[PDB]
């Protein structure tokens, strides 16, 4: 159970993007039916009133919280990966749209899943803004909580991998288009209880075996981490 509070550009904190810049669901609880329309943009896709400016290759950090700000951050037991994906704000996430410019799953090197270095990066993980065409774009973060994904939810809907699903406004001013941004996948559609990373028992099969789910990442993204890059106490 975890939600985005706002974004920083360049470790600028924007501010509380709650009902304002991301398109907040009523509360933190995890979208599970990979058919869902809610697997969009979670289950409160609207607009809302702000989009955050950014250029290309600003460092963008989302910063997650599980009930008040740079808490827990979300339960320990919620391992998983991250990814984030972005698509031309026009199409409200419908469509062939969404391109993969983030995935963390299993450091190998570290023996910890993106979600355990999120909590310890107080719920910040960035983005390197990519260099489409300036306009209007929909951020979406995406945290699969594994921790009862052995089953399908289409098998047992009490169990499944939980997706965490924030859609961040974010407009994209100055970019000089060098990577314009191609279709993508679909939201729901991409995932299926078929593909690779859905389905997973971390209690009988070892992490280093883990596979995300596809897509792979873009070619044109330009990378991020999962570190935390401003400090929400002096504020
Ligand atoms: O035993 C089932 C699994 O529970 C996980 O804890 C979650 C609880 O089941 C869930 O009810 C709770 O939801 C809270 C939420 O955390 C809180 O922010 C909100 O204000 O109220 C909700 C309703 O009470 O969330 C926790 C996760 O934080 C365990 O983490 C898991 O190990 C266990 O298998
Ligand atoms: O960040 C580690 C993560 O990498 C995943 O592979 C990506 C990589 O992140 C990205 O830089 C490159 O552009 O594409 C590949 C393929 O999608 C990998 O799938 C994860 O297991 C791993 O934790
Ligand atoms: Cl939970
Ligand atoms: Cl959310
Ligand atoms: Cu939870």
């Known amino acids: 159970h975890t939600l985005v509070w706002g974004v920083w550009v360049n470790g600028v904190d924007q501010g509380d993007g709650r009902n304002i810049y991301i398109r907040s669901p009523p509360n933190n609880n995890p979208v599970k039916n990979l058919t869902s329309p809610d697997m969009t943009c979670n289950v409160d896709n609207r607009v809302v009133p702000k989009s955050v400016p950014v250029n290309a290759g600003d460092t963008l950090t989302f910063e997650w919280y599980h009930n ?7 339960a320990s037991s919620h391992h ?4 984030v994906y972005i698509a031309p704000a026009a199409s409200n996430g419908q469509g062939n749209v969404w391109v993969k410019l983030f995935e963390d799953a299993y450091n190998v090197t570290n023996s910890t899943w993106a979600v355990d270095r999120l ?3 107080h719920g910040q993980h960035s983005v390197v803004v990519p260099h489409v065409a300036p306009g209007d774009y929909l951020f979406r973060a995406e945290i699969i909580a594994l921790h009862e994904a052995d089953s399908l939810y289409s098998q047992n809907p009490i169990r499944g991998a939980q997706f965490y699903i924030s859609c961040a406004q974010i407009t994209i001013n100055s970019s000089d288009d060098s990577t314009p941004l191609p279709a993508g996948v679909p939201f729901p559609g991409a995932y ?10 971390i209690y009988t099969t070892p992490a280093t075996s883990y596979v995300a789910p596809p897509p792979s ?5 330009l990378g991020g981490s999962i570190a935390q890059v401003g400090d929400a106490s002096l504020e």
């Open 217 to 221: 990442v873009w070619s044109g993204a």
């Open 68 to 74: 008040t700000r740079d808490d827990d951050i979300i």
């Open 80 to 83: 998983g990966p991250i990814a």
């Open 119 to 121: 909590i310890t990066a």
């Open 192 to 201: 299926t209880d078929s593909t690779p990373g859905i389905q997973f028992n």
